[PDB]
Design an enzyme around this catalytic site. Structure first.
Site, PDB file in Angstrom:
ATOM      1  N   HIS A   1      -4.062   6.672  -5.877  1.00 48.92           N
ATOM      2  CA  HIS A   1      -5.156   7.358  -5.178  1.00 48.92           C
ATOM      3  C   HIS A   1      -5.562   8.648  -5.902  1.00 48.92           C
ATOM      4  O   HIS A   1      -4.817   9.165  -6.745  1.00 48.92           O
ATOM      5  CB  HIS A   1      -4.762   7.664  -3.726  1.00 48.92           C
TER       6      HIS A   1
ATOM      7  N   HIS B   1     -14.866   6.436   2.708  1.00 49.93           N
ATOM      8  CA  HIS B   1     -13.588   5.725   2.737  1.00 49.93           C
ATOM      9  C   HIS B   1     -12.549   6.504   3.548  1.00 49.93           C
ATOM     10  O   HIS B   1     -11.843   5.945   4.399  1.00 49.93           O
ATOM     11  CB  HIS B   1     -13.091   5.475   1.313  1.00 49.93           C
TER      12      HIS B   1
ATOM     13  N   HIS C   1     -10.703   5.728   7.627  1.00 55.08           N
ATOM     14  CA  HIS C   1      -9.266   5.779   7.871  1.00 55.08           C
ATOM     15  C   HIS C   1      -8.904   6.689   9.049  1.00 55.08           C
ATOM     16  O   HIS C   1      -8.110   6.317   9.925  1.00 55.08           O
ATOM     17  CB  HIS C   1      -8.534   6.265   6.611  1.00 55.08           C
TER      18      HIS C   1
ATOM     19  N   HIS D   1       0.851  -1.170   0.000  1.00 53.62           N
ATOM     20  CA  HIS D   1       0.000   0.000   0.000  1.00 53.62           C
ATOM     21  C   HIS D   1       0.899   1.237   0.000  1.00 53.62           C
ATOM     22  O   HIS D   1       0.693   2.175  -0.772  1.00 53.62           O
ATOM     23  CB  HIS D   1      -0.942   0.002   1.205  1.00 53.62           C
TER      24      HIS D   1
ATOM     25  N   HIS E   1     -11.479  -2.053   3.196  1.00 52.25           N
ATOM     26  CA  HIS E   1     -11.433  -2.001   1.737  1.00 52.25           C
ATOM     27  C   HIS E   1     -12.220  -3.111   1.099  1.00 52.25           C
ATOM     28  O   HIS E   1     -12.663  -2.966  -0.034  1.00 52.25           O
ATOM     29  CB  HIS E   1      -9.992  -2.010   1.218  1.00 52.25           C
TER      30      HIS E   1
ATOM     31  N   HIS F   1      -7.344  -1.352  -5.602  1.00 57.27           N
ATOM     32  CA  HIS F   1      -7.574  -1.989  -4.313  1.00 57.27           C
ATOM     33  C   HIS F   1      -8.258  -3.341  -4.484  1.00 57.27           C
ATOM     34  O   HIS F   1      -8.034  -4.245  -3.682  1.00 57.27           O
ATOM     35  CB  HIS F   1      -8.385  -1.080  -3.379  1.00 57.27           C
TER      36      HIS F   1
ATOM     37  N   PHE G   1      -1.734   6.555   4.644  1.00 59.77           N
ATOM     38  CA  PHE G   1      -1.599   5.497   3.647  1.00 59.77           C
ATOM     39  C   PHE G   1      -0.374   4.612   3.876  1.00 59.77           C
ATOM     40  O   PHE G   1      -0.428   3.418   3.604  1.00 59.77           O
ATOM     41  CB  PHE G   1      -1.518   6.086   2.232  1.00 59.77           C
TER      42      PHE G   1
HETATM   43 CU   LIG Z   1      -5.254   2.898  -0.658  1.00 61.07          CU
HETATM   44 CU   LIG Z   2      -8.114   3.312   1.947  1.00 54.93          CU
END
Ligand SMILES: [Cu+2]
Ligand SMILES: [Cu+2]
Ligand SMILES: [W+6]
Length: 504
Positions: free
Chosen positions: A117, A246, A250, A94, A280, A126, A267
């Site tokens: 991203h 999303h 996080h 990632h 995810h 993903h 990230f």
């Molecule tokens: Cu990601």
């Molecule tokens: Cu994510």
């Protein structure tokens, strides 16, 4: 034809240096490059699995489903770090793709990094990441039909972190780097902004359902608005899910006492929390749901520049595999899916914000300048209001079913070493004392960004077809837009604001 193309990640890779606001004091390593074992990159071939892997809600797994997942993670954790299937190696994937590990050298641009991203690469990348991750887990425990859980935060009882992830280190699914205020069966906030909202659980649940509706229906109106904008070699609006629910999750899970809100808050460290993948897994599910809605505009991308974009991963045999966006659009071919409710409707399907009563509104949005009367760019160190000319008024149901009216907030410039967020309200004009909630019809949504400093320039899209009806303003020549900074905005500017009709 200039699709983004991962290089030989075992030959061309450099330490992560993007999206980490505090490198000198970071909790996880920035040496995110995958082990180079001298492997040749093979082309993808569709799996010959006898049956379909059925991913399960993390809060309602069987004894066997939980025990296997837990046993698989324990095995991955026990692997040497250098093993490409290891817990640490999987987390580094990632970091490599999200924080500047790779260049576009395979497209003839060795001085430009790949970022998956904030573009239409977000979902398919993903999906592939999880595809190999899941197949790796299953092989470690000798379970050829192994399937991941998914964090069903679109279901009220699915909204708190599942207790399977809690306890201590003796639980393989546990991670110490989580917000301690958010692991006591508290309900996730899918529009979190760093500050806990003091509202009843009943209201938080209702607004979470509205957030899913918003990401998948109100703002996710077409492929560009849902998947993210066009991104090709040599060089991008963020999609509705990515910058919405999303990103909220996080920031909600990450530990705010850590330098970069590790693990889930950034990230580069997110993959060290097992719940990252399960979050995810549900984001992957949203793509499938979004298509199942069968609304006009809810179609897959057909652009060759997207279809032929590709990534590289290690698989369960430590082989390097090149995979293309075009090959992951059909879940049946990837031999997995998601256990669904088998009911008439999703719990969020009708969470369109309630209609605003005219008796609850004053006549005007107040005294406010038009875009053409305003001098851009505008600094967002305070609330900002402007009237934006609409392309038309009083469109019929026919015209609305042919074209979305879309609010574009373009050229968002800001320091992206920190989490940034502002909210967008349209045609807010309530009478004094009128009862309000965090998910009123006036709320168009937000622009949220986890740190990704390469200083950065973004674009956000909001659908207005429902909103203008919900606020009784389909007949007004202008839409009054209110931008409200929540955090990391002390230096943010906005270059252009406009509304366009976007054919379906
Ligand atoms: Cu990601
Ligand atoms: Cu994510
Ligand atoms: W309460």
């Amino acid at each position: 034809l200039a699709p983004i193309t991962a290089p030989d990640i075992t030959s061309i890779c450099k330490d992560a240096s993007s999206g980490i606001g505090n490198q000198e004091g970071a909790i996880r390593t920035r040496k995110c490059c995958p082990p180079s074992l001298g492997k040749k990159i093979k082309d993808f071939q569709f799996p010959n699995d006898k049956k379909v892997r059925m991913r399960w809600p993390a809060h309602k797994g069987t004894k066997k489903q939980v025990d296997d997942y837990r046993r698989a993670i324990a095995a991955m954790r026990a692997l040497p770090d250098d093993d490409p299937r290891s817990f640490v190696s999987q987390a580094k994937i990632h970091c490599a793709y999200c924080n500047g590990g790779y260049t576009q050298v395979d497209s003839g641009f060795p001085d430009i990094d790949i970022q998956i991203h904030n573009s239409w690469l977000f979902f398919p990348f993903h999906r592939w990441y999880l595809y190999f991750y899941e197949r790796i887990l299953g092989s470690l425990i000798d379970e050829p039909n192994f399937a991941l859980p998914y964090w069903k935060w679109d279901e009220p009882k699915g909204m708190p972190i599942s207790n399977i992830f809690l306890g201590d280190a003796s639980n393989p699914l546990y991670d110490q780097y989580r917000d301690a205020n958010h692991i006591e069966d508290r309900i996730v906030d899918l529009d979190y902004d760093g500050k806990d909202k003091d509202i009843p659980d009943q209201q938080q649940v209702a607004c979470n359902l509205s957030t899913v509706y918003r990401d998948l229906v109100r703002n996710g109106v077409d492929p560009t608005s849902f998947f993210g904008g066009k991104y090709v070699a040599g060089d991008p609006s963020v999609g509705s899910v990515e910058a919405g629910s999303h990103t909220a999750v996080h920031r909600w899970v990450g530990d705010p006492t850590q330098p970069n809100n590790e693990d889930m808050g950034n990230f580069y460290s997110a993959g060290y929390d097992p719940v990252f993948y399960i979050h995810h897994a549900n984001v992957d599910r949203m793509w499938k749901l979004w298509k199942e809605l069968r609304l006009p505009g809810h179609v897959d991308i057909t652009d060759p520049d997207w279809l032929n974009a590709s990534y590289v991963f290690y698989d369960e045999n430590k082989d390097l595999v090149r995979v293309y966006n075009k090959d992951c659009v059909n879940l049946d071919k990837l031999k997995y899916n998601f256990i669904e409710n088998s009911k008439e409707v999703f719990p969020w399907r009708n969470s369109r914000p309630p209609q605003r009563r005219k008796s609850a509104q004053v006549a005007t949005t107040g005294d406010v300048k038009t875009v053409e009367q305003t001098k851009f760019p505008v600094r967002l160190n305070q609330i900002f209001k402007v009237r934006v000319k609409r392309p038309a008024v009083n469109r019929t149901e026919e015209e609305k079913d042919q074209a979305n009216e879309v609010l574009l907030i373009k050229k968002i410039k800001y320091d992206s070493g920190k989490f940034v967020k502002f909210d967008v309200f349209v045609n807010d004009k309530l009478k004094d004392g009128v009862f309000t909630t965090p998910c009123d019809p006036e709320y168009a949504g937000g622009f949220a960004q986890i740190p990704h400093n390469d200083v950065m320039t973004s674009t956000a899209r909001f659908g207005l077809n429902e909103l203008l009806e919900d606020t009784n303003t389909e007949g007004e020549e202008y839409a009054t837009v209110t931008l409200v900074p929540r955090t990391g905005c002390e230096d943010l500017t906005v270059g252009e604001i406009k509304i366009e009709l976007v054919p379906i």
